[PDB]
Coordinates of C-alpha atoms and ligand atoms in Angstrom, one line a residue:
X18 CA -15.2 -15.6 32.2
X19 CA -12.8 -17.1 34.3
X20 CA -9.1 -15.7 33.0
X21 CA -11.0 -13.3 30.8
X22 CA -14.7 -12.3 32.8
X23 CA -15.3 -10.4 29.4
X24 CA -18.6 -8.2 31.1
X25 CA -16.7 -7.6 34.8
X26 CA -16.5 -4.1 34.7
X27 CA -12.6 -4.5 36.6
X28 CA -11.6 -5.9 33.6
X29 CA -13.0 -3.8 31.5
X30 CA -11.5 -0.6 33.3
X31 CA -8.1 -2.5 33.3
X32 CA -7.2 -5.7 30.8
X33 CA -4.2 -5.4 30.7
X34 CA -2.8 -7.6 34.0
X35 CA -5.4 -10.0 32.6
X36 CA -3.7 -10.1 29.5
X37 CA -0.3 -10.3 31.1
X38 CA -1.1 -13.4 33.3
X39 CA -2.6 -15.4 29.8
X40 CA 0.8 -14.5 28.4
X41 CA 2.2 -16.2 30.9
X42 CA 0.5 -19.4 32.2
X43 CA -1.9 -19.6 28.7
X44 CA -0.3 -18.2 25.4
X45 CA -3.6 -20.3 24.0
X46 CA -6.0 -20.2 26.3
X47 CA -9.6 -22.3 25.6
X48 CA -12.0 -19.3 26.8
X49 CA -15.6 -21.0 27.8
X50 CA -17.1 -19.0 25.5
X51 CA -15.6 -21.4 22.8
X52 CA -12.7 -19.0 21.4
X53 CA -9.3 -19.9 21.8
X54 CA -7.9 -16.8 22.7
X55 CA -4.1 -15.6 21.4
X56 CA -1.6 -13.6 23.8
X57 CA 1.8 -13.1 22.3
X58 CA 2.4 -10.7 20.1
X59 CA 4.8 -13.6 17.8
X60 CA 1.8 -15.7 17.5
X61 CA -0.8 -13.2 17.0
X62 CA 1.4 -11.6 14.0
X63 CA 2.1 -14.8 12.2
X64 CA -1.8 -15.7 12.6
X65 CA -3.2 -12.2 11.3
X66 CA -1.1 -12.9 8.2
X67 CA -2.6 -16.7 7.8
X68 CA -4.1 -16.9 4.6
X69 CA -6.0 -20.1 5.8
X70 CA -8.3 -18.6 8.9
X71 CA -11.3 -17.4 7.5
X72 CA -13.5 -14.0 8.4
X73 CA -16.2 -15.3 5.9
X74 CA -17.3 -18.6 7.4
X75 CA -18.0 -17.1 11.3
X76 CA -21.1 -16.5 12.6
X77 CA -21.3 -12.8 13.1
X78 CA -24.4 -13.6 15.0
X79 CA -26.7 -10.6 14.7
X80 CA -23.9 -8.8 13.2
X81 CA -24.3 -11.0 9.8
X82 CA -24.5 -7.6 7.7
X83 CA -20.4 -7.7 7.9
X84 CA -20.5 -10.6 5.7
X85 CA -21.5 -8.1 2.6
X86 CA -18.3 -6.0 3.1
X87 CA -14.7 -6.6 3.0
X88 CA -14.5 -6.8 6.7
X89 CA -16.9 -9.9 6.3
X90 CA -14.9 -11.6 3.2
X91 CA -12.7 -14.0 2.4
X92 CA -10.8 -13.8 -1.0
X93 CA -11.5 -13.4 -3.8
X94 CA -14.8 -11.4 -2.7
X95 CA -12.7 -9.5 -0.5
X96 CA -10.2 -8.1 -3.0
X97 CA -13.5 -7.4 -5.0
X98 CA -14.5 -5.2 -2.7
X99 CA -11.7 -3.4 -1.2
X100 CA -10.5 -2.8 -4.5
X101 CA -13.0 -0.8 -5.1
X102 CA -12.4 1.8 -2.1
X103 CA -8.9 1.5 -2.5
X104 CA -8.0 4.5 -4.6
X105 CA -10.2 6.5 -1.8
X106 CA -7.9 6.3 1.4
X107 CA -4.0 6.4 -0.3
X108 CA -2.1 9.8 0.6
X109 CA -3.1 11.6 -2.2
X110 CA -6.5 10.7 -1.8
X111 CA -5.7 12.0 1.9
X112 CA -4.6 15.4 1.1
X113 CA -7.9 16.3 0.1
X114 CA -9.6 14.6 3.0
X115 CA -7.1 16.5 5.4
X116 CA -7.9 19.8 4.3
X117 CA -11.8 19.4 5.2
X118 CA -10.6 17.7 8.5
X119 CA -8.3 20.8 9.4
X120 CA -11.4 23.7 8.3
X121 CA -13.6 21.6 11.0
X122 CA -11.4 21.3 13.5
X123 CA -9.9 24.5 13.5
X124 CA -13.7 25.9 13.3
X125 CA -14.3 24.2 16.3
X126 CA -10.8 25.5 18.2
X127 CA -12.2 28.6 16.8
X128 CA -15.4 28.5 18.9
X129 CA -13.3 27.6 21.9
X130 CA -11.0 30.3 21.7
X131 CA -13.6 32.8 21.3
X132 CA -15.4 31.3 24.0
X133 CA -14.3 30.3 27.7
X134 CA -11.9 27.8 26.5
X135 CA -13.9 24.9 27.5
X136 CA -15.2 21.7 25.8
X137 CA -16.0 18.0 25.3
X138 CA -13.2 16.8 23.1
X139 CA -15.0 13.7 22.4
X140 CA -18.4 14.7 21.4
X141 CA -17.3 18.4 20.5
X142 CA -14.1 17.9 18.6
X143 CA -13.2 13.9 17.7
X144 CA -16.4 13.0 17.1
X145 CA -17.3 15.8 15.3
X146 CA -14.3 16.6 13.4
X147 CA -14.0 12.8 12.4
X148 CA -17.5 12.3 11.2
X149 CA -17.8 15.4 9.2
X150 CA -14.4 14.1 7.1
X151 CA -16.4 10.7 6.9
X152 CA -19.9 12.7 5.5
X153 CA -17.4 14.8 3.4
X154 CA -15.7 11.9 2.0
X155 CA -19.3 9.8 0.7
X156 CA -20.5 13.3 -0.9
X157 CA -23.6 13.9 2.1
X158 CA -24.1 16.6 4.5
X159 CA -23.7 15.5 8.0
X160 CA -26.9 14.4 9.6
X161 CA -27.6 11.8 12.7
X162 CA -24.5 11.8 13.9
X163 CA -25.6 10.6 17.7
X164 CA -27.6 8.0 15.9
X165 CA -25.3 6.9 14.3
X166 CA -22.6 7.1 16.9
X167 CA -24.9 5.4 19.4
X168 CA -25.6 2.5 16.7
X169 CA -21.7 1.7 15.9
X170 CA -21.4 1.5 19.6
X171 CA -24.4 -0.6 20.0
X172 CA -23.3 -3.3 17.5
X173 CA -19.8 -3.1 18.9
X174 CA -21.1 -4.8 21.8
X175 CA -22.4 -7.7 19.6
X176 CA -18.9 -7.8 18.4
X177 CA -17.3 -8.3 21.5
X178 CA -17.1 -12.2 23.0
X179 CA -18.8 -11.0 25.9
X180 CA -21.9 -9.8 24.0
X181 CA -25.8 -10.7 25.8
X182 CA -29.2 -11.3 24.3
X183 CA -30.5 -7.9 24.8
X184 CA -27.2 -6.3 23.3
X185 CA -28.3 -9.0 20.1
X186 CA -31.3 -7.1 19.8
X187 CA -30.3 -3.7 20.1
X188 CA -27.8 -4.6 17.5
X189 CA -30.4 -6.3 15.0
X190 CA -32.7 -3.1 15.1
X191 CA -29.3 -1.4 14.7
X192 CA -28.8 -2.9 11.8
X193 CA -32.2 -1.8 10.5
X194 CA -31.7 1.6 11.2
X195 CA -28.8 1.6 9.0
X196 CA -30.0 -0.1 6.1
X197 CA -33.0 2.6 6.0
X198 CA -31.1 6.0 6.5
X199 CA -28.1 5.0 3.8
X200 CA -31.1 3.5 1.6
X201 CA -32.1 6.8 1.9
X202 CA -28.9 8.2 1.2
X203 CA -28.4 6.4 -1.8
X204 CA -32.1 6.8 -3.4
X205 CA -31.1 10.7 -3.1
X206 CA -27.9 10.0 -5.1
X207 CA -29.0 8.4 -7.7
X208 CA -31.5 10.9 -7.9
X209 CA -29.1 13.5 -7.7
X210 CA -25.6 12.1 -8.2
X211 CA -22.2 14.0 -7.2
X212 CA -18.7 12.7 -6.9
X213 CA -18.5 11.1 -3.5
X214 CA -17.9 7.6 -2.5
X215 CA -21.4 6.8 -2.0
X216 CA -21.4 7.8 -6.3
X217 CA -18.3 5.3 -6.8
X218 CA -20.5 2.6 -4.8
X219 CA -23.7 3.1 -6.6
X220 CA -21.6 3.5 -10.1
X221 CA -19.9 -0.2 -9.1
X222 CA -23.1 -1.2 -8.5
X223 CA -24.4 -0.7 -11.9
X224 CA -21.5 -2.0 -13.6
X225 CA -22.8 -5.4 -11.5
X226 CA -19.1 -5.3 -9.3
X227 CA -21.3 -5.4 -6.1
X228 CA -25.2 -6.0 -4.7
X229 CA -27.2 -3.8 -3.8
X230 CA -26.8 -4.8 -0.2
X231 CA -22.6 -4.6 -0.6
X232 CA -23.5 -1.1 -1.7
X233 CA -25.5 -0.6 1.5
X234 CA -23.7 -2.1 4.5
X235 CA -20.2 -1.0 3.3
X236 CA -21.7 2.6 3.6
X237 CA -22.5 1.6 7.1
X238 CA -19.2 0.0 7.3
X239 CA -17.5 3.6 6.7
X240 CA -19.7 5.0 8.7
X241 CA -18.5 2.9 11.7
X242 CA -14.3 3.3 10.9
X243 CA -14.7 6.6 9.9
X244 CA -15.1 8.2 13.4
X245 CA -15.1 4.6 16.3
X246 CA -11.2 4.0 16.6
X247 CA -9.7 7.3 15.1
X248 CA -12.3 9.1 17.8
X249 CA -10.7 6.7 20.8
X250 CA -6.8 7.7 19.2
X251 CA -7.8 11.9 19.4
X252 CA -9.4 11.2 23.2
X253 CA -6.9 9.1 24.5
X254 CA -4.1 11.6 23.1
X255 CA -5.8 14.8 24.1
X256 CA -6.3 12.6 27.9
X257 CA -2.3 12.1 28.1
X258 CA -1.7 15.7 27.0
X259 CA -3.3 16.7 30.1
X260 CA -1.9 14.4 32.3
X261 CA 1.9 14.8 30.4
X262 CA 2.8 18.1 29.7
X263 CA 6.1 17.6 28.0
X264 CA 4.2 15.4 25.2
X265 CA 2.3 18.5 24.5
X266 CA 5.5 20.1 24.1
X267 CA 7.3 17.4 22.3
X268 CA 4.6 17.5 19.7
X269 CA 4.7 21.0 18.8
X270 CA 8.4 21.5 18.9
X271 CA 9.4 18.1 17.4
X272 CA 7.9 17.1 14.5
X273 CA 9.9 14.0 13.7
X274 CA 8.3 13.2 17.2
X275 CA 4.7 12.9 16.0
X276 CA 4.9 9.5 14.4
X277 CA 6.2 7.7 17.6
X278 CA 3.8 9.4 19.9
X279 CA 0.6 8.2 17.4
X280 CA 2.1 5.0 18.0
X281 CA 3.0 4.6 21.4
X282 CA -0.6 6.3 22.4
X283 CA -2.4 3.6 19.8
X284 CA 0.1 0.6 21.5
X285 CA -0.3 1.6 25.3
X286 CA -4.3 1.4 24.7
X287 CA -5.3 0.0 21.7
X288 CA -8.8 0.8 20.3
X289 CA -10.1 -2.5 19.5
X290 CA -9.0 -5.1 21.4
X291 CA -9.2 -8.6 19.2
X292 CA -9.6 -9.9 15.8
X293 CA -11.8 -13.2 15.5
X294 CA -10.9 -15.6 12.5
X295 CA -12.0 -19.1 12.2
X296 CA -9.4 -21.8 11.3
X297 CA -10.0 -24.3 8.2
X298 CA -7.0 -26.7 8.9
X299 CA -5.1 -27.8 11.8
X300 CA -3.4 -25.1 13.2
X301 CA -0.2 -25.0 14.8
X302 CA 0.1 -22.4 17.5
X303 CA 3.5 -22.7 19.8
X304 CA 2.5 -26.2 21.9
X305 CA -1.1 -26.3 20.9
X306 CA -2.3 -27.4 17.5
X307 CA -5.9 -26.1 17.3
X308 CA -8.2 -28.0 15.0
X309 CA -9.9 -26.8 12.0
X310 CA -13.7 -24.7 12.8
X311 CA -12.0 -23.4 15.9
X312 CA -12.8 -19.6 16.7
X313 CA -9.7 -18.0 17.3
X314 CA -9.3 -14.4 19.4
X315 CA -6.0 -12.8 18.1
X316 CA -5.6 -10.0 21.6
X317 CA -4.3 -7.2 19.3
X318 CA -4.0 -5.5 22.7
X319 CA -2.0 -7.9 24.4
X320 CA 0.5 -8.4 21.5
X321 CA 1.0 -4.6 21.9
X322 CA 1.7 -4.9 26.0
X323 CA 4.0 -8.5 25.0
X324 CA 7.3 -7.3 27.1
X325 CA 9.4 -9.8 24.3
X326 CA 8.8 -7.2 21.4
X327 CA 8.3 -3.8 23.8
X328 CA 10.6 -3.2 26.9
X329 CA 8.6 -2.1 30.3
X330 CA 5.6 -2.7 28.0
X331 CA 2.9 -0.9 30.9
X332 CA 5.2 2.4 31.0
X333 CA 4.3 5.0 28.3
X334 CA 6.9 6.3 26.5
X335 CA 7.0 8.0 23.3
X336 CA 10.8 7.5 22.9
X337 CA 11.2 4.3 21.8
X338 CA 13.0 2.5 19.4
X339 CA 11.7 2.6 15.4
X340 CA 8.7 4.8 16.7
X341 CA 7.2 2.2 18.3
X342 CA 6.0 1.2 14.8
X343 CA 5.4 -2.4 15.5
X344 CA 2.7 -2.7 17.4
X345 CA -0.6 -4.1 15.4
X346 CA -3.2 -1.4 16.6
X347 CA -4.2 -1.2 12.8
X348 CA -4.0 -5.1 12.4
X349 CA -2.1 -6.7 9.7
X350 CA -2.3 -9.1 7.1
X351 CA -5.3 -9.2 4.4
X352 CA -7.4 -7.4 6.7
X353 CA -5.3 -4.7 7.5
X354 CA -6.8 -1.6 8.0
X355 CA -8.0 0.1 5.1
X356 CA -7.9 3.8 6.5
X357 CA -4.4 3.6 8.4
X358 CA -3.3 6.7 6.3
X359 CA -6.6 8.8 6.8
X360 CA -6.5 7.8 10.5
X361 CA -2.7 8.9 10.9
X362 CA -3.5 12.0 9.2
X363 CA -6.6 13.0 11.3
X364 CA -4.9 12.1 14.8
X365 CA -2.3 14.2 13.6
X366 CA -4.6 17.6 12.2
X367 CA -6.2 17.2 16.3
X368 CA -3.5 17.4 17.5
X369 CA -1.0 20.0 15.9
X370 CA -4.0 22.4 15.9
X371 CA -4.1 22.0 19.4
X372 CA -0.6 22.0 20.2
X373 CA 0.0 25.0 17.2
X374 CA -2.7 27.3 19.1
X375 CA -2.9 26.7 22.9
X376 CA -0.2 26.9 25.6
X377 CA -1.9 23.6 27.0
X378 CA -4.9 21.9 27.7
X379 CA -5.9 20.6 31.1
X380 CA -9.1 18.5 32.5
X381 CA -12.0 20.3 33.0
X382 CA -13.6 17.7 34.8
X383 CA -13.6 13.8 35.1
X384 CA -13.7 12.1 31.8
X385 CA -16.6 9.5 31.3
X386 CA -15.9 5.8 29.8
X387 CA -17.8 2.9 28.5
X388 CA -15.0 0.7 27.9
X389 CA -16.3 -2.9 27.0
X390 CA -13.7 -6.2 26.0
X391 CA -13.5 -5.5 22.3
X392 CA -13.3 -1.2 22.1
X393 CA -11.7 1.0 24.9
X394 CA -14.0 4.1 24.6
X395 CA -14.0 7.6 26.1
X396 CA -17.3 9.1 25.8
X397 CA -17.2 12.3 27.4
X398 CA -14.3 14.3 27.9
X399 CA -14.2 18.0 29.2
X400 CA -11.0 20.1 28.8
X401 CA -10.0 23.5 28.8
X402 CA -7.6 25.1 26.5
X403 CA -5.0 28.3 27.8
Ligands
HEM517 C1 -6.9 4.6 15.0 C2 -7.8 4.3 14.1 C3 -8.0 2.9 13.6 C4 -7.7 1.7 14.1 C5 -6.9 1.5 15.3 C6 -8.1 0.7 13.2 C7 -7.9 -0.7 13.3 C8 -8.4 -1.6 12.4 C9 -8.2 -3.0 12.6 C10 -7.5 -3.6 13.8 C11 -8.7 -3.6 11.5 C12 -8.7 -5.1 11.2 C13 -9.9 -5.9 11.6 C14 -9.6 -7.4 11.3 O1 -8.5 -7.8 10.9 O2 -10.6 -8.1 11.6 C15 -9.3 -2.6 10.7 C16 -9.9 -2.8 9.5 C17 -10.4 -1.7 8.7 N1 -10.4 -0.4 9.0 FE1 -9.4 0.5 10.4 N2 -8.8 1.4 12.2 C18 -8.8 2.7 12.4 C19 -9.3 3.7 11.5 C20 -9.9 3.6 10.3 C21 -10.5 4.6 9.5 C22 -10.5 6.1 9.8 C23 -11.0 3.9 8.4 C24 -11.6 4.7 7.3 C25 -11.4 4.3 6.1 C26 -10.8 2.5 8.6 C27 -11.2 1.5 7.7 C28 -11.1 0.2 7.9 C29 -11.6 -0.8 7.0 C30 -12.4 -0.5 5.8 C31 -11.2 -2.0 7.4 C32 -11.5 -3.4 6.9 C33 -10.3 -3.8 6.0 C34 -10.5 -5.2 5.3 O3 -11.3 -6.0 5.8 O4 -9.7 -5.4 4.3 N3 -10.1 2.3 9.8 N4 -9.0 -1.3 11.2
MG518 MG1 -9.0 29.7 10.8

């Protein structure tokens, strides 16, 4: 705990003044939990760029199953695999995918409009809207979406540094869940197959470029990015339009606007917090050199609040400089994320419908969180459209 009490529900409503005293007295601070955790945004780039830590040789703990996707891989199984999804998430591949994400969200805004104007943005709209896209994308109909919303979140708290016993569990039988329903999934493919992902993965399969469990687990790893941050960008946006009328404004009347205010909502509240790597040489960080098999925390989050690369880093503003296109919200390096493009793009469809149909949206009542240390998380969220 101490500088960073990862389960004290203050911090976990509010990290950021943590973050911002680590920056200052412990730009490499040995956490108790045996991470040495990484504040500055200058040292957290250059790090998520090192070819040398290593995703592949931490223990994932009950979250081991991450080891049999590119998330969980070092190179060269990790260009192995992600060269295989590659050609899914580029733009073109994102033009398609934009055009299902629009008919559901405009389906939904339909219901609303026709209705009382009232809903949960989070379950009713980002969830929704984002998971559909996801199903759309692998060739399935949507089915257990709670289940499987409720599972990401469950192994999430594994994830985080913080993680208990119990949460191990819950995350093993998780696990288990998953590997069942996408066995599931994919028995019914090759049964009957279509032109999905879930085809190309089975199809790579057979052509011996991945296991059988690759195949599985890196269903469930789409699963999980395909609705957990993009879900936390469309709440937190739809949250500031209510608060911040002009950025409602700004984003229907400006479109060379939209860009900077994805960015600036992703820097000022970043989804995930951290990345973990594991260094295999002496590593040189500022004043400290960190031995090799040292767990490092790179704070995504804090890098994004570092006052040396973003002025009056606390304040929001959608203004700044070069669209406030720096920050590392969607990581960097090797493991960069995969579905920045598709993520960009279905932020944006939420969010021009809205602003392209309603005069405004306001709260409809008080939001509902479950924020841990790894993923800031909004899980109910009632608003009412005019
Ligand atoms: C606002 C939304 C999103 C944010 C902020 C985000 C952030 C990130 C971050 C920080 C990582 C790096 C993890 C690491 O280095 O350990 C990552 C990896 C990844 N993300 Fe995203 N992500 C988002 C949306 C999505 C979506 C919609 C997809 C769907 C394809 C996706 C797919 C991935 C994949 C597959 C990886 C692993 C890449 C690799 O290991 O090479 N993400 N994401
Ligand atoms: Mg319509």
């Amino acid at each position: 705990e101490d500088l960073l009490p990862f389960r004290d529900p203050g911090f976990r409503a509010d990290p950021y003044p943590y973050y911002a005293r680590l920056r200052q007295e412990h730009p490499v601070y040995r956490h108790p939990v045996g991470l040495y955790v990484v504040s500055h945004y200058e040292d957290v780039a250059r790090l998520i760029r090192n070819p040398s830590l290593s995703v592949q040789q931490l223990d994932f703990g009950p979250a081991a199953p991450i080891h049999h996707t590119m998330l969980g891989k070092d190179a060269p199984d990790h260009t192995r695999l992600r060269r295989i999804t590659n050609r899914w998430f580029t733009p073109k591949a994102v033009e398609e995918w934009s055009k299902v994400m629009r008919a559901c969200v405009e389906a939904v805004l339909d219901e609303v409009e026709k209705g009382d104007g009232t809903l949960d943005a989070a379950d009713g709209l980002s969830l929704k809207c984002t998971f559909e896209t996801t199903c759309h994308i692998f060739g399935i109909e949507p089915t257990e979406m709670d289940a499987i919303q409720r599972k990401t979140y469950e192994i999430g708290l594994s994830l985080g540094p913080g993680g208990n016993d119990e949460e191990a569990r819950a995350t093993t039988e998780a696990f288990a869940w998953f590997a069942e329903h996408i066995r599931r999934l994919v028995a019914d493919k090759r049964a009957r197959p279509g032109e999905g992902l879930i085809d190309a993965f089975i199809a790579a399969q057979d052509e011996g470029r991945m296991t059988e469990e690759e195949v599985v687990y890196s269903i469930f790893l789409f699963f999980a990015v395909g609705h957990l941050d993009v879900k936390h960008l469309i709440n937190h946006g739809i949250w500031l339009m209510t608060q911040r009328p002009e950025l409602f404004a700004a984003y229907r009347d400006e479109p060379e606007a939209r860009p900077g205010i994805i960015n600036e909502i992703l820097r000022i509240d970043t989804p995930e917090s951290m990345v973990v790597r594991l260094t295999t040489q002496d590593t040189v960080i500022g004043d400290t050199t960190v031995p090799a098999g040292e767990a490092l925390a790179l704070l995504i989050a804090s890098a994004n609040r570092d006052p040396e690369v973003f002025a009056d880093p606390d304040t929001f503003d959608h203004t700044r400089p070069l669209a406030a296109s720096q920050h590392l919200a969607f990581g960097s390096g090797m493991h960069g994320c995969a579905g920045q493009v598709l993520a960009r793009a279905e932020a944006d469809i939420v969010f021009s419908s809205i602003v392209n149909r309603f005069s405004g949206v306001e709260l409809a009542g008080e939001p509902a969180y479950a924020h841990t240390e790894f993923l800031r998380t909004i899980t109910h969220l009632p608003v009412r459209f005019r």
